[PDB]
């Protein structure tokens, strides 16, 4: 019985930060809605 590396390893998440104007800006926008509001 040996615990594998997945022993509370993956709780973290991708971090969304603003930047230069691109279509990815709406991905950041989506993230803001997705987290501040619980969609």
């Amino acid at each position: 019985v040996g615990v594998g590396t997945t022993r509370r390893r993956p709780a973290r998440i991708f971090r969304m930060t603003v930047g230069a104007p691109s279509a990815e800006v709406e991905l950041v926008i989506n993230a803001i809605y997705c987290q501040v509001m619980d969609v």
């Binding site: 991708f14 971090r15 930060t17 691109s22 279509a23 990815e24 709406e26």
Partner: protein
């Protein structure tokens, strides 16, 4: 591009490009000529594909093609076909790039708003994309058709 997407992820992580990510870019370099050849074929047969797919789309959605639809009259149908041609050119650009992000910037952003402003039916646009996929399968090799079909499938989702 594929390099653009991978570099975007790496820049967010603030890490130099990972070995696997670099390998992905190297694979893009290896298959660049084949991707360009497929794109050149699409551009070469662009007009014929447009005509055949237009006939199939009109058959699928007769009401739009007929008067009393969005493509009511020759002029309205021609404008609709011109918009479809712009879609096809964007699809060729995306297939050459290997990443659907350029196509998404060209057409996917606010696509629902544009279709609503025109009044035209989004499902019929999607059906036209499917007809283009069948024509592309006819005019491409089996390996080429699969990749082109994948990009076209992203286009179908964009139509929805």
């Amino acid at each position: 591009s594929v390099v653009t997407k991978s570099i975007v992820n790496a820049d967010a992580e603030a890490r130099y490009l990972s070995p696997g990510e670099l390998d992905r870019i190297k694979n893009f370099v290896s298959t660049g000529e084949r991707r360009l050849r497929i794109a050149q074929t699409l551009t070469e047969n662009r007009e014929r594909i447009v005509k055949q797919a237009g006939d199939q789309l009109f058959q699928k959605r007769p009401d739009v093609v007929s008067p009393g639809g969005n493509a009511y009259g020759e002029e309205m149908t021609a404008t609709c076909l011109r918009d479809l041609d712009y879609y096809l050119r964007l699809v060729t650009y995306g297939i050459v790039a290997g990443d659907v992000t350029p196509i998404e910037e060209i057409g996917l952003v606010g696509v629902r708003e544009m279709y609503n402003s025109l009044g035209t039916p989004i499902p019929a646009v999607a059906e036209g994309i499917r007809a283009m996929k069948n024509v592309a399968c006819s005019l491409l090799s089996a390996e080429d058709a699969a990749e082109a079909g994948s990009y076209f499938d992203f286009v179908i989702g964009a139509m929805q």
